[PDB]
Scaffold this active site. Structure first.
Site, PDB file in Angstrom:
ATOM      1  N   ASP A  25       0.890  -1.141  -0.095  1.00  0.00           N
ATOM      2  CA  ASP A  25       0.059   0.128  -0.042  1.00  0.00           C
ATOM      3  C   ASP A  25       1.008   1.191   0.015  1.00  0.00           C
ATOM      4  OD1 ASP A  25      -1.881   1.855   0.645  1.00  0.00           O
ATOM      5  OD2 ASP A  25      -3.003   0.869   2.056  1.00  0.00           O
ATOM      6  N   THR A  26       0.957   1.980  -1.214  1.00  0.00           N
ATOM      7  CA  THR A  26       1.702   3.081  -1.453  1.00  0.00           C
ATOM      8  C   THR A  26       1.252   4.433  -0.688  1.00  0.00           C
ATOM      9  OG1 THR A  26       0.879   3.653  -3.661  1.00  0.00           O
ATOM     10  CG2 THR A  26       2.991   2.282  -3.458  1.00  0.00           C
ATOM     11  N   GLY A  27      -0.237   4.219  -0.324  1.00  0.00           N
ATOM     12  CA  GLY A  27      -0.992   5.249   0.450  1.00  0.00           C
ATOM     13  C   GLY A  27      -0.670   5.288   2.055  1.00  0.00           C
TER      14      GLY A  27
HETATM   15  C1  LIG Z   1     -14.776  -3.805  -0.486  1.00  0.00           C
HETATM   16  O1  LIG Z   1     -13.503  -3.383  -0.783  1.00  0.00           O
HETATM   17  C2  LIG Z   1     -12.657  -2.665   0.139  1.00  0.00           C
HETATM   18  O2  LIG Z   1     -13.369  -2.326   1.331  1.00  0.00           O
HETATM   19  N1  LIG Z   1     -11.755  -2.283  -0.080  1.00  0.00           N
HETATM   20  C3  LIG Z   1     -10.673  -1.605   0.730  1.00  0.00           C
HETATM   21  C4  LIG Z   1     -10.266  -0.234  -0.015  1.00  0.00           C
HETATM   22  O3  LIG Z   1      -9.589  -0.255  -1.139  1.00  0.00           O
HETATM   23  N2  LIG Z   1     -10.715   0.927   0.492  1.00  0.00           N
HETATM   24  C5  LIG Z   1     -10.491   2.003  -0.033  1.00  0.00           C
HETATM   25  C6  LIG Z   1     -11.161   2.309  -1.462  1.00  0.00           C
HETATM   26  C7  LIG Z   1     -10.926   3.610  -1.922  1.00  0.00           C
HETATM   27  C8  LIG Z   1     -10.317   4.773  -1.089  1.00  0.00           C
HETATM   28  C9  LIG Z   1      -9.898   4.255  -0.255  1.00  0.00           C
HETATM   29  C10 LIG Z   1     -10.026   3.286   0.536  1.00  0.00           C
HETATM   30  C11 LIG Z   1      -9.260   2.857   1.868  1.00  0.00           C
HETATM   31  C12 LIG Z   1      -8.125   2.228   1.931  1.00  0.00           C
HETATM   32  C13 LIG Z   1      -6.797   3.142   1.557  1.00  0.00           C
HETATM   33  C14 LIG Z   1      -5.523   2.238   1.334  1.00  0.00           C
HETATM   34  N3  LIG Z   1      -4.541   3.156   1.596  1.00  0.00           N
HETATM   35  C15 LIG Z   1      -4.313   4.289   2.421  1.00  0.00           C
HETATM   36  C16 LIG Z   1      -4.220   3.702   3.778  1.00  0.00           C
HETATM   37  O4  LIG Z   1      -3.838   4.816   4.485  1.00  0.00           O
HETATM   38  C17 LIG Z   1      -4.332   4.989   5.741  1.00  0.00           C
HETATM   39  O5  LIG Z   1      -5.102   3.903   6.220  1.00  0.00           O
HETATM   40  N4  LIG Z   1      -3.847   5.972   6.437  1.00  0.00           N
HETATM   41  C18 LIG Z   1      -2.690   6.143   7.153  1.00  0.00           C
HETATM   42  C19 LIG Z   1      -2.011   4.731   7.498  1.00  0.00           C
HETATM   43  C20 LIG Z   1      -1.011   4.803   8.182  1.00  0.00           C
HETATM   44  C21 LIG Z   1      -0.369   3.590   8.534  1.00  0.00           C
HETATM   45  C22 LIG Z   1      -0.994   2.530   8.137  1.00  0.00           C
HETATM   46  C23 LIG Z   1      -1.951   2.463   7.338  1.00  0.00           C
HETATM   47  C24 LIG Z   1      -2.646   3.518   7.212  1.00  0.00           C
HETATM   48  C25 LIG Z   1      -5.919   5.106   2.290  1.00  0.00           C
HETATM   49  O6  LIG Z   1      -6.983   3.822   2.570  1.00  0.00           O
HETATM   50  C26 LIG Z   1      -9.422  -2.314   0.950  1.00  0.00           C
HETATM   51  C27 LIG Z   1      -9.718  -3.524   1.371  1.00  0.00           C
HETATM   52  C28 LIG Z   1     -10.542  -4.245   2.527  1.00  0.00           C
HETATM   53  C29 LIG Z   1     -10.750  -5.610   2.597  1.00  0.00           C
HETATM   54  C30 LIG Z   1      -9.896  -6.287   1.982  1.00  0.00           C
HETATM   55  C31 LIG Z   1      -9.045  -6.078   1.010  1.00  0.00           C
HETATM   56  C32 LIG Z   1      -8.578  -4.619   0.753  1.00  0.00           C
HETATM   57  C33 LIG Z   1      -8.547  -1.639   2.197  1.00  0.00           C
HETATM   58  C34 LIG Z   1      -8.919  -1.132   3.432  1.00  0.00           C
HETATM   59  C35 LIG Z   1      -8.290  -0.613   4.339  1.00  0.00           C
HETATM   60  C36 LIG Z   1      -6.834  -0.592   3.912  1.00  0.00           C
HETATM   61  C37 LIG Z   1      -6.385  -0.943   2.844  1.00  0.00           C
HETATM   62  C38 LIG Z   1      -7.195  -1.352   1.855  1.00  0.00           C
END
Ligand SMILES: COC(=O)N[C@H](C(=O)Nc1ccccc1CC[C@@H]1CN[C@H](COC(=O)NCc2ccccc2)CO1)C(c1ccccc1)c1ccccc1
Ligand SMILES: [Cl-]
Ligand SMILES: [Cl-]
Ligand SMILES: [Cl-]
EC number: 3.4.23.16
Lengths: 99, 99
Positions: A25-27
């Site tokens: 996860d690059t975000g």
């Molecule tokens: C039904 O499908 C989903 O529920 N999909 C989720 C998803 O893509 N959801 C989503 C969609 C569109 C925009 C933003 C987001 C939310 C996911 C993004 C991930 N990168 C950044 C992560 O960054 C942060 O959480 N912030 C800071 C941080 C710091 C340290 C560690 C983690 C995070 C920002 O959030 C997904 C997922 C869930 C279950 C199983 C597999 C994957 C997921 C959830 C949480 C984290 C990563 C991925």
């Protein structure tokens, strides 16, 4: 390897001698893993996600292998929808984005 | 370009005639932008991540220029803490993870 993004970039990691699946996860600035046992002491950390802030346990200098690449660094443990490998460990494995 | 992960992978995007900064997020399935107006029909959606869920508006067939590359797809709009370019548009610009 070169990983395309048509599907979630899920890879196998090894931590505490056990295999787990995790998302590259690059975000994410940090690495957050679902509830598990880790050695040593932990420190508190608040992390902000898409839905708000959560409390996690911060463990430092933890050995973790990601897609066959060894890393040693900070691992956060807490309630996450999926195990996430964030930039702190993606940099250790030499990961970049390219287009 | 080759984008390092030492810092957050923030790039300039162009959408609806507006220049914005957005995060290239391989962990996001979808693209979610902070509150803004977009043309056409929309429908509500809930997206989840760390911290829980947020309600967003889903707009389909939206044109976005990302770091000079054109990409069309679904764009979600809601209370995200940062503009996120997710996998649905990262694939369109040929973005890959490499290590
Ligand atoms: C039904 O499908 C989903 O529920 N999909 C989720 C998803 O893509 N959801 C989503 C969609 C569109 C925009 C933003 C987001 C939310 C996911 C993004 C991930 N990168 C950044 C992560 O960054 C942060 O959480 N912030 C800071 C941080 C710091 C340290 C560690 C983690 C995070 C920002 O959030 C997904 C997922 C869930 C279950 C199983 C597999 C994957 C997921 C959830 C949480 C984290 C990563 C991925
Ligand atoms: Cl670290
Ligand atoms: Cl799409
Ligand atoms: Cl491709």
């Amino acid at each position: 390897p070169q990983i395309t993004l048509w599907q979630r970039p899920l890879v196998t990691i090894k931590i505490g001698g056990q295999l787990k699946e995790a998302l590259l996860d690059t975000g994410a600035d940090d690495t957050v893993l679902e509830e598990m046992n880790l050695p040593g002491r932990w420190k508190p950390k608040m992390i902000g996600g898409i839905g708000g802030f959560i409390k996690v346990r911060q463990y430092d200098q933890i050995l973790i292998e990601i897609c066959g690449h060894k890393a040693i660094g900070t691992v956060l443990v807490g309630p996450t929808p999926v195990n996430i490998i964030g930039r702190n460990l993606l940099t250790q494995i030499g990961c970049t984005l390219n287009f």
